[PDB]
mmCIF file of C-alpha atoms and ligand atoms in Angstrom:
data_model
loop_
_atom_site.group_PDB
_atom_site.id
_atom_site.type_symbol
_atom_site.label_atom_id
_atom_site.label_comp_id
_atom_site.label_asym_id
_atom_site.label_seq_id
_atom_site.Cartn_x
_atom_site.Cartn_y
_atom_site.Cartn_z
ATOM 1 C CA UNK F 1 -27.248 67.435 29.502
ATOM 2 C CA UNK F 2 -29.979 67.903 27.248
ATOM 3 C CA UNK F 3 -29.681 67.960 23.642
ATOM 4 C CA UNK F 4 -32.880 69.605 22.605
ATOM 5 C CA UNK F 5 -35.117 70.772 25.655
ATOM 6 C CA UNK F 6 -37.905 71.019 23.714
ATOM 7 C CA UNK F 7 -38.422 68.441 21.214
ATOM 8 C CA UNK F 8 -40.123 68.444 18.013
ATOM 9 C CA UNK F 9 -43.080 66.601 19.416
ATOM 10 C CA UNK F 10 -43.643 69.052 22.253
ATOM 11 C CA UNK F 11 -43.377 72.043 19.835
ATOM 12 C CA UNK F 12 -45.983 70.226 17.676
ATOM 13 C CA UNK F 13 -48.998 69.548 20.399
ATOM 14 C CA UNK F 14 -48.360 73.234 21.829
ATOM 15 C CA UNK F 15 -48.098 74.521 18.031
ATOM 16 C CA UNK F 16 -46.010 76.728 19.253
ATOM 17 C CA UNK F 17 -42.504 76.767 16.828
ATOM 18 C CA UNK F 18 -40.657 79.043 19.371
ATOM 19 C CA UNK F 19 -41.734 77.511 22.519
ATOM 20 C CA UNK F 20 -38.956 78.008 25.162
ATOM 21 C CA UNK F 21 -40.865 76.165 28.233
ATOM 22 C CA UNK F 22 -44.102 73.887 28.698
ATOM 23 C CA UNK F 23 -46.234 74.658 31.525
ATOM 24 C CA UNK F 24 -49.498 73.323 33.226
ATOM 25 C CA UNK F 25 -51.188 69.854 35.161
ATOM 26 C CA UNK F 26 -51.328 70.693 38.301
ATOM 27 C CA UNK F 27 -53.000 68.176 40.523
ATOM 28 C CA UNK F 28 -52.932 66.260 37.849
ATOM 29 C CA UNK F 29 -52.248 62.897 38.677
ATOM 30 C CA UNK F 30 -50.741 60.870 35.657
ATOM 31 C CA UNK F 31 -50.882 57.205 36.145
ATOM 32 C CA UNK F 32 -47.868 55.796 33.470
ATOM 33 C CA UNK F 33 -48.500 51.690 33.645
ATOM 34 C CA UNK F 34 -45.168 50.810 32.285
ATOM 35 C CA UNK F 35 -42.161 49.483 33.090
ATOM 36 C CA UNK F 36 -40.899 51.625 36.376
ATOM 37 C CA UNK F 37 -40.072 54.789 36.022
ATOM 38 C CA UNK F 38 -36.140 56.411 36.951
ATOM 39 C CA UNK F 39 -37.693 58.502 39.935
ATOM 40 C CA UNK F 40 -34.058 60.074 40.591
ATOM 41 C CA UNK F 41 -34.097 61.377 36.939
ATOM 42 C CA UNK F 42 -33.482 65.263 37.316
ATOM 43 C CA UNK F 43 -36.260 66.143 34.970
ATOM 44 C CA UNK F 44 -38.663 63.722 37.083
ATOM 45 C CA UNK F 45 -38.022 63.794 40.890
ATOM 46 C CA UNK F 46 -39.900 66.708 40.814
ATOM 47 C CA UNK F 47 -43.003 65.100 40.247
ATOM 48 C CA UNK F 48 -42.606 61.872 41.083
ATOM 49 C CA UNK F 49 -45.504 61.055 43.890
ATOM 50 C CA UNK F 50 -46.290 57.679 43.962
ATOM 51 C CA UNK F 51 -44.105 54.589 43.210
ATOM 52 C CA UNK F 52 -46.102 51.109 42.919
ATOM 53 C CA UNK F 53 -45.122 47.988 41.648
ATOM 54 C CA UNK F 54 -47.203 45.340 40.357
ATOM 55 C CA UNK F 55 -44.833 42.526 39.013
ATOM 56 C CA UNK F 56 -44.043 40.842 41.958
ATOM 57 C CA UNK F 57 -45.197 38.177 44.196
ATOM 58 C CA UNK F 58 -47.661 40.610 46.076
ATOM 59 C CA UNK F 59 -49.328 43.295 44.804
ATOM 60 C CA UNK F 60 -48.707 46.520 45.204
ATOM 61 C CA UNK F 61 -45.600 46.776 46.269
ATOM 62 C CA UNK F 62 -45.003 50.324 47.508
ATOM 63 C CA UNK F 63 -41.922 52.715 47.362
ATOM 64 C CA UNK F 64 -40.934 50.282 44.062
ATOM 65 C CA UNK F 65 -41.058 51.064 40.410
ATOM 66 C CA UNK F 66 -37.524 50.600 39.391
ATOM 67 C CA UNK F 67 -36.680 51.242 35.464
ATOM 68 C CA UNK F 68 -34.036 48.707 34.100
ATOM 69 C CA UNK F 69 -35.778 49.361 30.348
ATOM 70 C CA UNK F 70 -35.869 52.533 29.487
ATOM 71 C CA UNK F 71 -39.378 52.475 28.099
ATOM 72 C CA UNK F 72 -41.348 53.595 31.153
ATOM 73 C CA UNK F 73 -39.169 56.769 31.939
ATOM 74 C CA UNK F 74 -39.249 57.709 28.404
ATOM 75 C CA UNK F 75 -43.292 57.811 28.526
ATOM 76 C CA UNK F 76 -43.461 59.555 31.850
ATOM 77 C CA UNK F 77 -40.657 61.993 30.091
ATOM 78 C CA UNK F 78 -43.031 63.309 27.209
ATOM 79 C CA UNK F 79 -46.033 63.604 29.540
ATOM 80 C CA UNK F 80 -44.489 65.257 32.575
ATOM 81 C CA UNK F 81 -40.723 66.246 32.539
ATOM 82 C CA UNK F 82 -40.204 69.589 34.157
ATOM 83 C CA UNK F 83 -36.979 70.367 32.651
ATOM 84 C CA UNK F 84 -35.370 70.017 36.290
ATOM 85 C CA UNK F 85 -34.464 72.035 39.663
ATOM 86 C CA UNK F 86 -31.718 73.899 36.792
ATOM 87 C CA UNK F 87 -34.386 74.161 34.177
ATOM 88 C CA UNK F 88 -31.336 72.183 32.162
ATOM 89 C CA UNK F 89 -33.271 69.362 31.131
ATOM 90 C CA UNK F 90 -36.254 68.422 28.802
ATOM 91 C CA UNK F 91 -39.717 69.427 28.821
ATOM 92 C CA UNK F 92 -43.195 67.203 29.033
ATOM 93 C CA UNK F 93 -46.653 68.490 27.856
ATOM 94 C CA UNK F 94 -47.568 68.624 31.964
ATOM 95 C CA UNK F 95 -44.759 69.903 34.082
ATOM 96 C CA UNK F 96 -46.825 70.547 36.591
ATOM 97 C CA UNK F 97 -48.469 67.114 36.837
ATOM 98 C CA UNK F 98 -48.046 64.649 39.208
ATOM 99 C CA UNK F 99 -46.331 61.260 38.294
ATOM 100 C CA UNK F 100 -47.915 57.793 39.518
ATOM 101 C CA UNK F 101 -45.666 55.544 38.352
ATOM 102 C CA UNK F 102 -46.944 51.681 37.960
ATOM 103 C CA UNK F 103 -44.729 48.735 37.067
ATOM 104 C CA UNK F 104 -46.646 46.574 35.232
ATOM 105 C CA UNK F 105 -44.608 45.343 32.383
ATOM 106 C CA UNK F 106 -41.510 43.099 33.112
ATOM 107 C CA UNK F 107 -38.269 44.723 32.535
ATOM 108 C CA UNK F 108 -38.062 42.750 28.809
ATOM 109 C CA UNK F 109 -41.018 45.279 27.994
ATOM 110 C CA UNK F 110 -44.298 42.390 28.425
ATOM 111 C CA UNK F 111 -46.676 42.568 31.179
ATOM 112 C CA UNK F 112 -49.574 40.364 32.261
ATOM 113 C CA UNK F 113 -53.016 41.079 31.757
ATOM 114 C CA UNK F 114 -53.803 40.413 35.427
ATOM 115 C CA UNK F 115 -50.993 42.631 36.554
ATOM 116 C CA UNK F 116 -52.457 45.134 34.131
ATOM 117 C CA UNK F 117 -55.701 45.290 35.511
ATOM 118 C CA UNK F 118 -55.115 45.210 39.101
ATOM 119 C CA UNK F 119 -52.852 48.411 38.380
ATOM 120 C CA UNK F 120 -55.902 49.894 36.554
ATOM 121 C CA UNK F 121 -58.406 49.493 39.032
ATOM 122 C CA UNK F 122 -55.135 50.577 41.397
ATOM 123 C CA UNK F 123 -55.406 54.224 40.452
ATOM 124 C CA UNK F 124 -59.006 54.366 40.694
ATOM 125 C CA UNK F 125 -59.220 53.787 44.024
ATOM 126 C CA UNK F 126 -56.351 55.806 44.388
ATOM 127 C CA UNK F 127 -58.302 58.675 42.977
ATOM 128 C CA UNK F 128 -61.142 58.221 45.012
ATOM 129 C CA UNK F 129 -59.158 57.888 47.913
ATOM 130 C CA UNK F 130 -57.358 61.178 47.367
ATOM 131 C CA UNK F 131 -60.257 62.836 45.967
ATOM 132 C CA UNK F 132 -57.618 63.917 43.039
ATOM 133 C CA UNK F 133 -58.433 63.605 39.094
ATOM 134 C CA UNK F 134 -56.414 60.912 37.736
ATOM 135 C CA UNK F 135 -55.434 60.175 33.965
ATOM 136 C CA UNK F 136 -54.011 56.134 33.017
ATOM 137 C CA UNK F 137 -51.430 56.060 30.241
ATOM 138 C CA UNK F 138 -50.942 53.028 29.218
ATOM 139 C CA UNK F 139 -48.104 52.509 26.373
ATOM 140 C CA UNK F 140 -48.947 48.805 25.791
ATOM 141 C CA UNK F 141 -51.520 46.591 24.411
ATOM 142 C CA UNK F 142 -51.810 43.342 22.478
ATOM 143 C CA UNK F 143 -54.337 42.372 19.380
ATOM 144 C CA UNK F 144 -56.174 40.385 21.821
ATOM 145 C CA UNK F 145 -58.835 42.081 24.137
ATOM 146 C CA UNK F 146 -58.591 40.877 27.666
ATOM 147 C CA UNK F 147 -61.484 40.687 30.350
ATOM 148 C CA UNK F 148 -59.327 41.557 32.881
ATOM 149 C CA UNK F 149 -57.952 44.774 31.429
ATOM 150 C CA UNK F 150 -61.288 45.749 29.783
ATOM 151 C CA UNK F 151 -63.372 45.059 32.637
ATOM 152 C CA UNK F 152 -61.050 47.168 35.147
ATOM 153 C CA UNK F 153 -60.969 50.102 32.457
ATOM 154 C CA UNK F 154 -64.832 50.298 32.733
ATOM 155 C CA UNK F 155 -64.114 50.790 36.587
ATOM 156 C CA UNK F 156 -61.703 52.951 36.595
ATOM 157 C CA UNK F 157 -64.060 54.919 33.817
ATOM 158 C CA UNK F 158 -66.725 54.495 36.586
ATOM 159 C CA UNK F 159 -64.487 56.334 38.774
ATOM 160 C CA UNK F 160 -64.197 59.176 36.877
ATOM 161 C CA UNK F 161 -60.425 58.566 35.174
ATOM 162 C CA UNK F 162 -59.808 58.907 31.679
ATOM 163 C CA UNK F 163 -58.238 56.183 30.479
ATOM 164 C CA UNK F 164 -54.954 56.820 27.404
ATOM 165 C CA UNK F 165 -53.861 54.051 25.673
ATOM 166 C CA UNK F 166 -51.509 53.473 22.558
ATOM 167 C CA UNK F 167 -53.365 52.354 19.455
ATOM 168 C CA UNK F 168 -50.614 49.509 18.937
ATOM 169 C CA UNK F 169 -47.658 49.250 16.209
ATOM 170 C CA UNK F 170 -49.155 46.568 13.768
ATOM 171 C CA UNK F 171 -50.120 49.019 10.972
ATOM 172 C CA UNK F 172 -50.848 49.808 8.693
ATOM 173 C CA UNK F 173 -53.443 47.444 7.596
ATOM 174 C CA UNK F 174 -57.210 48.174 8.831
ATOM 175 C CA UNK F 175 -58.278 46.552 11.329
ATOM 176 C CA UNK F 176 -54.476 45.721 13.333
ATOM 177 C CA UNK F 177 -55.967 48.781 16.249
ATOM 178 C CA UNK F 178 -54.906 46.696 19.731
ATOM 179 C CA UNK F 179 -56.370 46.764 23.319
ATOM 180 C CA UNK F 180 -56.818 48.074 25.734
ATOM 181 C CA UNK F 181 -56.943 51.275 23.134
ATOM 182 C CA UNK F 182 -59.578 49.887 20.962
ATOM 183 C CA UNK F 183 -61.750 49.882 23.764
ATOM 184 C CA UNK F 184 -65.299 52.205 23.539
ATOM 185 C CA UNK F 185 -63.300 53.827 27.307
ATOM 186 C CA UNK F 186 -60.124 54.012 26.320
ATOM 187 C CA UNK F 187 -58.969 57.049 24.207
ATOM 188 C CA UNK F 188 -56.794 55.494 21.326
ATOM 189 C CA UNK F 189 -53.672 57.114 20.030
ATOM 190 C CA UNK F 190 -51.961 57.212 16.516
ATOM 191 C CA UNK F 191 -48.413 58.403 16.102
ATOM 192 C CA UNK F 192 -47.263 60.800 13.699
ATOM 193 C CA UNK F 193 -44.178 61.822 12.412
ATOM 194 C CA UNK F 194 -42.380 64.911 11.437
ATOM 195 C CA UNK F 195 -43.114 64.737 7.741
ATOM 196 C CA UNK F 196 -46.235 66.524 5.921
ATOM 197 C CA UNK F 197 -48.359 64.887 3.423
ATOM 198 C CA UNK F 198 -51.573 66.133 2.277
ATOM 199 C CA UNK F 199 -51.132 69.509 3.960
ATOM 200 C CA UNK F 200 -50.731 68.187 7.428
ATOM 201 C CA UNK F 201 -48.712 65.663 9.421
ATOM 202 C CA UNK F 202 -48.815 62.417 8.730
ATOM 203 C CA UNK F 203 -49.396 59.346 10.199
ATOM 204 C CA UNK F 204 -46.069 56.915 10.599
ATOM 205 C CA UNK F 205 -46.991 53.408 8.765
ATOM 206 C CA UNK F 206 -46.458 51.105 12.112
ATOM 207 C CA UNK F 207 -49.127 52.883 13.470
ATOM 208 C CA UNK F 208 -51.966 50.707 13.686
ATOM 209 C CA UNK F 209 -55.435 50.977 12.268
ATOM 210 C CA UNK F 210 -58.704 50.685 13.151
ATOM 211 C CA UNK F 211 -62.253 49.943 11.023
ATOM 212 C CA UNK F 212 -63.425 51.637 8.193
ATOM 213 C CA UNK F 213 -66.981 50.628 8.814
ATOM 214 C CA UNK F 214 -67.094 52.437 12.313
ATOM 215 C CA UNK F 215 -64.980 55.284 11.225
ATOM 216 C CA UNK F 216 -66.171 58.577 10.081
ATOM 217 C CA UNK F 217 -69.211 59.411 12.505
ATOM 218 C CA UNK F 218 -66.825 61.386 15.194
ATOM 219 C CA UNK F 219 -68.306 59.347 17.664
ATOM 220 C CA UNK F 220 -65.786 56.808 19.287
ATOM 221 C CA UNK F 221 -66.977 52.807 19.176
ATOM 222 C CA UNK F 222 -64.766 49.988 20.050
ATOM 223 C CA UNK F 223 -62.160 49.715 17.477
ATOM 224 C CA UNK F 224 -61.945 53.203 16.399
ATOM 225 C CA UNK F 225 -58.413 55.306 16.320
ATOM 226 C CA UNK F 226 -59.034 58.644 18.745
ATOM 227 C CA UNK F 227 -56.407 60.767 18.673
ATOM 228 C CA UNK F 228 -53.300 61.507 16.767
ATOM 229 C CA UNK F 229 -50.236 62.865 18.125
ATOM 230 C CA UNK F 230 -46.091 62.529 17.525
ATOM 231 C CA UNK F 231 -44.425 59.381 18.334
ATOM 232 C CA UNK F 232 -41.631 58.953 15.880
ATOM 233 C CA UNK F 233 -38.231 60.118 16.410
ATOM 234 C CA UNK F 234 -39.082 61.406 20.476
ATOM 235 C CA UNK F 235 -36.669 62.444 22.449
ATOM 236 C CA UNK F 236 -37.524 62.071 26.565
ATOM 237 C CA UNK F 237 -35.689 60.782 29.694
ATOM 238 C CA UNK F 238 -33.676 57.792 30.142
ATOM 239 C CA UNK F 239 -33.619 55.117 32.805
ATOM 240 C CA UNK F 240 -30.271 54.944 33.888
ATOM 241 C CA UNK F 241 -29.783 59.156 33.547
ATOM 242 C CA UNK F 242 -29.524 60.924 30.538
ATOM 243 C CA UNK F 243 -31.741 60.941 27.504
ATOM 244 C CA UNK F 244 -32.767 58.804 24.485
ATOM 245 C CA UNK F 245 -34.565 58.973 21.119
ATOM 246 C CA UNK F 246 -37.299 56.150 20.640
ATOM 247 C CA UNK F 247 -40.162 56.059 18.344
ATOM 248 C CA UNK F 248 -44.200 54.243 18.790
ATOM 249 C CA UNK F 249 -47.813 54.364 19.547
ATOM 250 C CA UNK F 250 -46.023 54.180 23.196
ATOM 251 C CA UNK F 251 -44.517 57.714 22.745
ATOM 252 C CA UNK F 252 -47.907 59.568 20.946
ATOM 253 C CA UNK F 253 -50.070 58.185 24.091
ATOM 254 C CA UNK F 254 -48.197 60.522 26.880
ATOM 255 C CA UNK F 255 -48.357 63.144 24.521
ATOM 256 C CA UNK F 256 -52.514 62.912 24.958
ATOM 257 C CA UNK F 257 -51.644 62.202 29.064
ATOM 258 C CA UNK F 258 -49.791 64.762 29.117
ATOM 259 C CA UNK F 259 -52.437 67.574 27.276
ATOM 260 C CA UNK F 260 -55.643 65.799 28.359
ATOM 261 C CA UNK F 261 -53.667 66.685 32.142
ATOM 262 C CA UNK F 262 -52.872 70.303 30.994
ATOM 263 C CA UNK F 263 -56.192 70.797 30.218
ATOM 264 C CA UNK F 264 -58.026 68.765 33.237
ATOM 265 C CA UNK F 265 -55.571 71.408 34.964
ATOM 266 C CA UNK F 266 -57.516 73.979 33.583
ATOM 267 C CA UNK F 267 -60.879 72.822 34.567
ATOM 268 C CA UNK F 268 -60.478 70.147 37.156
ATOM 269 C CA UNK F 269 -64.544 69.892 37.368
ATOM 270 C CA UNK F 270 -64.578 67.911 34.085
ATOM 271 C CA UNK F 271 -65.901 65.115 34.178
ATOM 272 C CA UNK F 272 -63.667 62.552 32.382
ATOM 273 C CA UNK F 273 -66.591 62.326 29.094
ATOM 274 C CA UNK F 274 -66.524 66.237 29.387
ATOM 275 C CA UNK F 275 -62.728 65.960 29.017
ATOM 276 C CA UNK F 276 -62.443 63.416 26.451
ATOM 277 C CA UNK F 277 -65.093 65.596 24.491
ATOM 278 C CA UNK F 278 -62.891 68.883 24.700
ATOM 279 C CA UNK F 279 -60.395 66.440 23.556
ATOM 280 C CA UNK F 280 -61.980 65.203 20.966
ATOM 281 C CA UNK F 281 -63.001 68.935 19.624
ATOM 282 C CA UNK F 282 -59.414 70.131 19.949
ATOM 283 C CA UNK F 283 -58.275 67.071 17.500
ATOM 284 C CA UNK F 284 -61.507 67.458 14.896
ATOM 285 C CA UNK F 285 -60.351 71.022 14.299
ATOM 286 C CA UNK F 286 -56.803 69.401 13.001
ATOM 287 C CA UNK F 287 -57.764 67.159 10.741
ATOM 288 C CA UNK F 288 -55.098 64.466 9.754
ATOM 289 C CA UNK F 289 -54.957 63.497 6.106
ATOM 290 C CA UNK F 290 -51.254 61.978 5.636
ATOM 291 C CA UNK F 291 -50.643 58.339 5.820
ATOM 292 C CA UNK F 292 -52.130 55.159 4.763
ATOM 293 C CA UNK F 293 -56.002 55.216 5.248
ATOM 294 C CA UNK F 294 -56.069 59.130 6.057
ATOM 295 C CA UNK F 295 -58.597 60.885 4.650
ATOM 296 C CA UNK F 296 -60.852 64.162 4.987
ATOM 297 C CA UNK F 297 -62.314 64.015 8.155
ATOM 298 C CA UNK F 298 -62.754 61.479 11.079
ATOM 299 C CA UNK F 299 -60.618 58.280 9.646
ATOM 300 C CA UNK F 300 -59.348 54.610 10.542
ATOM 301 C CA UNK F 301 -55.676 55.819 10.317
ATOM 302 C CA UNK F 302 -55.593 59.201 12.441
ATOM 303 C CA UNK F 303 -59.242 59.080 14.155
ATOM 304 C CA UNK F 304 -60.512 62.466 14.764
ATOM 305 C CA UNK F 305 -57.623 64.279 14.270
ATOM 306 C CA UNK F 306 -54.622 65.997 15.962
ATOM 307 C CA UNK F 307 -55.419 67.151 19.590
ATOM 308 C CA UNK F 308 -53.145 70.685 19.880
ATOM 309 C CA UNK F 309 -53.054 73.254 22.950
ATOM 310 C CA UNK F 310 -54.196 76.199 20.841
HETATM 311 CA CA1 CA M 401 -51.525 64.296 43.354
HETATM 312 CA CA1 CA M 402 -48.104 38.933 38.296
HETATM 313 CA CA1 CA M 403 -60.795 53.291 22.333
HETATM 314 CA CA1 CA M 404 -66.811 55.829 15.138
HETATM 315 CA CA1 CA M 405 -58.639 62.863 8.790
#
């Protein structure tokens, strides 16, 4: 069913060529804010836990997160697919993690702000009443920042959940870095593709850019690019069964989901700074110099670099 079980963008963040299986997350919770997830997917079921939907005329609605896009699946795909009870399907960065999946985008692909948020602060409570560490992926955002969403990203920060978001596909002019990703608690995420320039990967030219004035310092302030990882050309799960090959900012952010869960995994007494730090260090030592605005070091195009398992 699968036509590559391990895609190119999975071999990349393990750096691992040969890699015949992913592995890792457990009790992980990945929150994908999207639109629905196909929680009968093979490669899914096995992790899907909870099922929320926040489009509708009261909010949540439990036991619903139905996936008539595509989009949503796709995300939760790269961060979490387990390759299936036949090990016949495709592999995520976290098999092992557990899959909150949030409707909060219509099924044409736009969400509210207010729908947004209240999913946000959602799966921090949901975290605190579990007692479980909980990473937000959110493969959205607009060039507008929003009270709602920013205010309900500082609580769920509060709450000790990292927040992943996609740095937006407006690029690649400085300056076109969206929200909730250009947020000082929101990790922002740059795709790459599968082409080297420079000596490393570089970054795809939708990808959108932050500030030069605020780039540089390795320390993140609102506006600033994070984290670089692949997004063109991805192959992951598809809503109505099978597969598909889409390309964003909206398939790099799961990548980070996906390791910052492997990771947590690892050390679930992280806090979620001490995460994003480790984070942070894994992507400095792979610095990303391809692509409009790349440079040596910490820069408006790539951020701090590409964040890698080893
Ligand atoms: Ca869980
Ligand atoms: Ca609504
Ligand atoms: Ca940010
Ligand atoms: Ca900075
Ligand atoms: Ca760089």
């Amino acid at each position: 069913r699968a036509s590559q079980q391990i895609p190119w963008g999975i071999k990349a963040i393990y750096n691992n060529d040969t890699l015949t299986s992913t592995t890792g997350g457990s009790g992980i919770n990945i929150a994908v804010l999207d639109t629905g997830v196909n929680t009968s997917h093979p490669d899914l079921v096995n992790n899907v836990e909870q099922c929320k939907d926040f489009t509708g005329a009261t909010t949540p609605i439990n036991n619903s997160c139905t996936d008539r896009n595509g989009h949503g699946t796709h995300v939760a795909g790269t961060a979490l697919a387990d390759g299936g009870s036949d090990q016949a399907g495709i592999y995520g960065v976290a098999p092992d993690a557990d899959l909150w999946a949030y409707k909060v985008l219509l099924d044409s692909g736009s969400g509210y702000s207010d729908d947004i948020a209240a999913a946000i602060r959602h799966a921090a409570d949901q975290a605190t009443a579990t007692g479980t560490k909980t990473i937000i992926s959110m493969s959205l955002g607009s060039s507008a920042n929003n009270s709602l969403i920013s205010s309900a990203v500082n609580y769920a920060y509060s709450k000790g959940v990292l927040i992943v978001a996609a740095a937006g596909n407006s690029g690649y002019s400085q300056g076109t870095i969206g929200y909730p990703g250009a947020l000082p608690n929101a990790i922002a995420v740059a795709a790459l593709e599968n082409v080297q320039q420079n000596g490393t990967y570089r970054v795809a030219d939708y990808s959108s850019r932050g500030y030069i004035s605020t780039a540089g310092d390795y320390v993140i302030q609102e506006g600033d690019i994070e984290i670089s990882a692949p997004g063109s050309s991805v192959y992951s799960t598809w809503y109505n069964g099978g597969y598909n090959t889409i390309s964003g900012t909206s398939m790099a952010t799961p990548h980070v989901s996906g390791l910052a869960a492997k990771i947590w995994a690892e050390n679930p007494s992280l806090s979620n700074t001490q995460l994003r730090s480790n984070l942070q260090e894994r992507a400095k030592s792979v610095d990303i110099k391809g692509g409009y605005g790349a440079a040596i070091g910490d820069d408006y195009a790539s951020g701090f670099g590409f964040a890698r398992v080893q």
